């Protein structure tokens, strides 16, 4: 079988995208953030501490096909400190027509204040490799994993938009979706992440510095985090730009026409348009804007978040030896 489902930005800034997913019998529909940098399918549920709930929730006991996975428990924290935990159910999950039975659904007993305050995200969906699944004591399989048997092809594609909706496909690659050919590149799973290595970078119409950048493809992340000197290299091409401790990252006059950033993928070159890099005014009506490229020194890993991913059509090849395809859009 195959699957097609729309993904739409939760706001004006493209901070993240949510996709509708259908849980249980009869189908309860939640908008979860598809996250290729994690491996847990969890959502707000009837079990969640009420003062911590502001979200559409999953009610286990109103689903016929739901089953409690005895003694299993989960606890997760993400890159920004946010976290959540609860118990586990298995149940039927559907994405854009693709239906999986027995998928582990992690019921949230408690969630951190950031999740609480986001009314648009009802839960997350892990699309990273299963070794990062927090279910204890026996790790559960991700949606993709569970689905791989019945997929026409063991692949999923991310087609995120720039301030527009996009698509997540499972089982096939929509050739109409991109321009040129897809350049595949090796993936390391030692870190459980879709981890790869760019061939380099080019700022604006500047030269392509050939240098190896090990990062991850992380749909759950907004910005593009690269080493400090790359990033410096960027911003120095923008007159008004400077780093700001107060904002915590490079700021520049909103009226600035931003240079493109080019990253390597094999002999291929992906070009993020300048606009993608203007993220927004630091507060509504401000003269200063926040940069879409930032140093990853403090994080500890290079992260190709949504600002770089919406710039391309991305293929997540889930063959036994996984690959990553990149095509321009």
């Amino acid at each position: 079988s195959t699957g097609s489902a729309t993904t739409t930005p939760i706001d004006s800034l493209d901070d993240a995208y949510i996709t509708p997913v259908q849980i249980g019998t009869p189908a309860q529909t939640l908008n979860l953030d598809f996250d290729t940098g994690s491996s847990d399918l969890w959502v707000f549920s009837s079990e969640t501490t009420a003062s911590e709930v502001x979200q559409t929730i999953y009610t286990p006991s109103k689903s016929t096909t739901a089953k409690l996975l005895s003694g299993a428990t989960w606890s997760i924290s993400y890159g920004d400190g946010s976290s959540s935990s609860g118990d586990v159910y298995t149940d039927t999950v559907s994405v854009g027509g693709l239906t999986v039975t027995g998928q582990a659904v992690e019921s949230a007993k408690k969630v951190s204040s950031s999740f609480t305050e986001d009314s648009t995200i009802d839960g997350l969906l892990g699309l990273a490799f299963s070794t990062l699944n927090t279910v204890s004591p026996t790790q559960q399989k991700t949606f993709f994993d569970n689905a791989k048997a019945s997929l026409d092809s063991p692949v999923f594609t991310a087609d995120l938009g720039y301030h527009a909706p996009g698509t997540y496909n499972f089982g096939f690659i929509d050739t109409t979706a991109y321009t040129g050919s897809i350049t595949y590149t090796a993936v390391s799973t030692k870190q459980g992440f879709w981890e790869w290595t760019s061939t380099g970078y080019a700022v604006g119409s500047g030269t392509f510095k050939s240098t190896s950048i090990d990062g991850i493809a992380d749909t759950g992340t907004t910005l593009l985090y690269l080493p400090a000197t790359v990033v410096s290299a960027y911003w120095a091409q923008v007159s008004g730009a400077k780093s700001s401790s107060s904002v915590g990252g490079y700021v520049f006059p909103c009226s600035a026409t931003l240079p493109s950033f080019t990253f390597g993928v094999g002999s291929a070159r992906i070009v993020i348009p300048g606009d993608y890099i203007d993220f927004g005014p630091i507060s509504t009506g401000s003269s200063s804007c926040f940069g879409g490229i930032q140093s990853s020194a403090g994080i500890g890993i290079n992260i190709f978040g949504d600002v770089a991913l919406k710039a391309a059509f991305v293929v997540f090849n889930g063959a036994t030896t996984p690959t990553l395809g990149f095509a321009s859009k």
């Binding site: 939760i10 706001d11 800034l13 901070d15 993240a16 953030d33 996250d35 290729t36 940098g37 994690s38 491996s39 847990d40 997760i76 924290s77 993400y78 890159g79 920004d80 986001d118 997350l124 990273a128 990062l132 927090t134 992380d218 749909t219 759950g220 992340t221 907004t222 910005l223 994080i299 500890g300 992260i303 978040g305």
Partner: peptide, 7 residues
Amino acid sequence: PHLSXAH
């Protein structure tokens, strides 16, 4: 807002 999804 700003999201950074499991370190």
